[PDB]
């Protein structure tokens, strides 16, 4: 079927077909373009007209231009031939190494796994970060979400999880960049080339990359997450592997939906967001799940507008995640890094029957003492430190020591801090926090715990203080 263009509003194009009106979610090609421009059908406006979301820039479009229905959704090449490449939203390789010669193509729109396919195994995933492993431990196959405002350390944390987990990984790995810095994508591509994970000369690459970044129009930013999902879904279903899916950033999917919903003629909901925010996020996030035919461990960065953690987008995302790590700016401005908030991060495996009663008691004690210190904050601020109880002074000292200890230097953060990155096993973390709780270090200065590895390095630094 061949239609013509009757309306162009930014990234939303209304096209009127004569006969053969394409169903919803089909891909359309615009004729007369230097590069490929795909329009995805979103509505049927009646009178043989449909509304579409463009997948690239829409400048130079003229009313009356031809459009050919492809007869199928946006299909992207899937398979092992996609490892070590970089594709955009519509599946074209943008790494300038030639076409992706894979055998089959999959559509980016698919139905979420059913109920009887869901798997409920909850083995722990040791990352090597003290705060994450202590208070909000991740799980294999679970969904991880890294909340945080602008400039608090989401990207550094994702690079650390790629360094600690995506390197020692057995299965495959997908990284879908959704509306973020392009130089970060270039740096990741080259840092993966050098480390042998992406191997440009033979067929032993272990990572596939999809990239629609913050320079792309809202259609590409809205559907590149779905493209990455499609790649990971192939690696999970058709090969039974264990996949890792790093999404950064997934708030841009909702934000692009919001940027297009104004033009699609819809009444705005709360905070200007689209009325279909929750169901869009649901039909996206329900595909990112570990079935019983495979497993997908997902780490999704999640921006937080104006540091508002009650904004509809993160507040809706919270329900979709198995473990949340909420970075805080009030903590990053204390110099603590990672800026994880120990009193806002949760996990579904923080249960004494899973992580062991000992790990559970340690985590709960840390959280309780930090919460008591947070309650004392105002008194300490106004009436000074010297008007507290002796037990309260003990808890304040221990809690500040625990605050410093929860920080840790990263192997990827050495470039702009110098310190050597540490990787603290779970046992060392549990032991060190048992010891700080028991008060076995109330003689060292708190400054000894700032930016160290395990507790041995803490006491070594405390000695070096003299």
């Amino acid at each position: 079927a061949t239609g013509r263009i009757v309306a162009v509003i930014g990234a939303v194009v209304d096209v009127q077909f004569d006969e053969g009106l394409p169903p919803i979610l089909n891909a359309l090609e615009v004729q007369g373009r230097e590069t490929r421009l795909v329009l995805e059908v979103a509505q049927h406006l009646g009178e043989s007209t449909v509304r579409t979301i463009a997948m690239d820039g829409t400048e130079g479009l003229v009313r009356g231009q031809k459009v050919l229905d492809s007869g199928a959704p946006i299909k992207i090449p899937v398979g092992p031939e996609t490892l070590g490449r970089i594709m955009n939203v519509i599946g074209e390789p943008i790494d300038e190494r030639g076409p992706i010669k894979t055998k089959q193509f999959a559509p980016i729109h698919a139905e979420a796994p059913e109920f009887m396919e869901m798997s409920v195994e909850q083995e722990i995933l040791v990352t090597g970060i003290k705060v994450v492993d202590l208070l909000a431990p991740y799980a294999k196959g679970g969904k991880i979400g890294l909340f945080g405002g602008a400039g608090v350390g989401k990207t550094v944390l994702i690079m650390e999880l790629i360094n600690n987990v995506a390197k020692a990984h057995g299965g495959y790995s997908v990284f879908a960049g959704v509306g973020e810095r392009t130089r970060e994508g270039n740096d990741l591509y080259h840092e993966m080339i050098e480390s042998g994970v992406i191997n440009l000369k033979d067929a032993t690459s272990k990572v596939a990359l999809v990239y629609g970044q913050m320079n792309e129009p809202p259609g590409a930013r809205a559907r590149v997450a779905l493209t990455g999902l499609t790649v990971a879904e192939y690696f999970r279903d058709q090969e039974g592997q264990d996949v890792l899916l790093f999404i950064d950033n997934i708030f841009r999917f909702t934000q692009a939906g919001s940027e297009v919903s104004a033009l699609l003629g819809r009444i705005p909901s709360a905070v200007g967001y689209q009325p279909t925010l929750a169901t869009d996020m649901g039909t996206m996030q329900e595909r990112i799940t570990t079935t019983k035919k495979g497993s997908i461990t997902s780490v999704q960065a999640i921006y937080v507008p104006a540091d508002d953690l009650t904004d509809p987008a993160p507040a809706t995302t919270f329900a979709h995640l198995d473990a949340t790590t909420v970075l805080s700016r009030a903590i990053a401005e204390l110099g603590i890094y990672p800026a994880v908030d120990p009193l806002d991060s949760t996990s579904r495996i923080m249960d004494p029957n899973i992580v062991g009663s000992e790990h559970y008691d340690v985590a709960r004690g840390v959280q309780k003492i930090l919460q008591d210190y947070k309650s004392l904050q105002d008194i300490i601020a106004i009436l000074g430190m010297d008007e507290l109880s002796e037990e309260d002074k003990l808890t304040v000292s221990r809690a500040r020591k625990i605050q410093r200890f929860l920080s840790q230097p990263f192997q990827v953060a050495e470039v702009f801090t110098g310190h050597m990155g540490k990787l603290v096993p779970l046992k060392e973390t549990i032991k060190g926090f048992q010891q700080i709780l028991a008060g076995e270090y109330d003689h060292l200065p708190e400054q000894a715990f700032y930016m160290v590895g395990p507790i041995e390095e803490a006491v070594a630094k405390a000695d070096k203080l003299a």
Partner: protein, 477 residues
């Protein structure tokens, strides 16, 4: 004729509905019979909504509107250097017509992943605080953020002036062409700034795009893109370009006005849903191109004004999430006389530590660590730490419109962090540094020249520096 011509149906709200133009393209520059120009924004089944790049007063209903056939573009090239143009590339300094022969679309896309390469070359700002603790490399996007009257435009002007020592040299690989886009500032401010740059003789390599406060909101919304295209010209030809959007808060305000006069759903603080894309597509075009594309680069210094030091607002956080760092200018620090009032505790450059020279790194890693200790403390050693930190913060203070070469800065920071000021009075460090620099530029041109050429501090140069600063310090008060 209703295919290359239209009639204005309804003007008002900064948008002109036009009947006709069946052959117009989206984002095409149409021309009104009033002499004005505009962009074809909305193409609807019966009318065309055109954004007007000027005063609506000049347009009546029924005016004929001709189309140019070209997507909105600006004239680029080296003929712009030393010219003050408006957001449409027209000379507003009365020095004749812009002799440009090439044009470039303002709405282009940023280079992808492959055409880029990591930032490696230094971009010398001339400010001790920036060059030492917040290093900026060619190809970065460093955000200058702070309250009103805290020193942002002064930092940008000091950078543009500092690039003079390179733009007179020999190797075309270190020269930097500067562009200063003014978005909603007072026009007297821009005139005085142009004069200040003409005195420092930094206009011969600078362009000034001015969409001031008395220009229509579409002009303030378009000026950043005109500037960024004038910079992309240099970037795509192996040359290096710096660009300062001063500032982006006022472009965001102009875009919010354009969006509300178009009846689009306002979001947080009544901002449109796409006030992020607005900036992102603009700050992603500042990139470092690899050698297979020319080796050129484009550095962006977006400016953001915060209300009551609040950095967790909507637009400030957007730009923090777009750029590659920030430079926090506090107002309390600016009140106590610290100038530039850079909060070195919150300022950061994620991709700059790979752009410092060897010598500046040799002194600045040390300096950063002692300043970190001084800041976190505020015993017998911590008193020494506070004394050294006070001396170093007094060493970071700097004049205005007097940027320092890299060798002079590394020499001063060396004299500072090597302990040779731990006995002097804090209130005298400023004059000590001034006199010290005068002495070193008088009797130590060879040491400065070899620190420059080497880009590093060898042990011979280290010893020379030690005995030089000790000879000067002994012969001091």
């Amino acid at each position: 004729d209703l295919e290359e011509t239209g009639r204005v149906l309804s003007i008002g709200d900064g948008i002109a509905r036009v009947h006709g133009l069946r052959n117009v393209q989206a984002e095409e520059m149409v021309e009104f019979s009033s002499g004005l120009k505009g962009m074809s924004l909305n193409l609807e089944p019966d009318n065309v909504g055109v954004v007007v790049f000027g005063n609506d007063k000049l347009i009546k209903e029924g005016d004929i509107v001709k189309r140019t056939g070209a997507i909105v573009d600006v004239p680029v090239g080296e003929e712009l250097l030393g010219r003050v143009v408006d957001a449409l590339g027209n000379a507003i300094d009365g020095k004749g017509p812009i002799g440009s022969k090439t044009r470039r679309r303002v709405g282009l896309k940023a280079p992808g992943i492959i055409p880029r390469i990591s930032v490696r070359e230094p971009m010398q700002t001339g400010i001790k605080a920036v060059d030492s603790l917040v290093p900026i490399g060619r190809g970065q996007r460093e955000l200058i953020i702070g309250d009103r009257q805290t020193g942002k435009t002064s930092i940008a002007i000091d950078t543009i002036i500092n690039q003079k020592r390179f733009n007179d040299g020999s190797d075309e690989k270190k020269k930097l062409y500067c562009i200063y886009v003014a978005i909603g500032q007072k026009r007297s401010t821009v005139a005085q700034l142009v004069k200040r740059l003409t005195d420092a003789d930094a206009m011969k390599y600078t362009i000034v795009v001015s969409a001031t406060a008395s220009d229509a909101a579409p002009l303030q919304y378009l000026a950043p893109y005109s500037g960024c295209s004038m910079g992309e010209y240099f970037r795509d030809n192996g040359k290096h370009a710096l660009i300062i959007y001063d500032d982006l808060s006022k472009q965001a305000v102009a875009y919010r006005q354009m969006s509300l006069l178009l009846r689009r759903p306002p979001g947080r603080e009544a901002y449109p849903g796409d006030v992020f894309y607005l900036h992102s597509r603009l700050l992603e075009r500042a990139a470092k191109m690899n050698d297979a594309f020319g080796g050129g680069s484009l550095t962006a210094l977006p400016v953001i004004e915060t209300q009551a030091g609040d950095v967790s607002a909507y637009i400030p956080t957007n730009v923090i999430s777009i750029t590659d760092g920030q430079i926090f200018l506090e107002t309390e620090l600016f009140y106590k006389g610290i100038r530039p009032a850079i909060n070195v505790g919150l300022s950061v450059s994620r991709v700059g530590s790979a752009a410092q020279t060897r010598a500046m790194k040799q002194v600045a890693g040390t300096m950063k660590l002692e300043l970190a200790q001084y800041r976190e403390v505020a015993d017998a050693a911590t008193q020494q730490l506070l004394s050294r930190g006070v001396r170093l913060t007094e060493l970071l203070k700097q004049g205005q419109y007097s940027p320092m070469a890299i060798e002079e800065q590394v020499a001063v920071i060396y004299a500072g962090v090597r302990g040779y000021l731990d006995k002097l009075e804090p209130s005298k460090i400023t004059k000590f540094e001034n006199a010290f620099l005068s002495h070193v530029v008088s009797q130590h041109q060879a040491l400065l020249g070899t620190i420059r050429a080497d880009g590093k501090i060898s042990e011979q140069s280290d010893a020379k520096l030690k005995e030089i600063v000790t000879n000067f310090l002994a012969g001091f008060e």
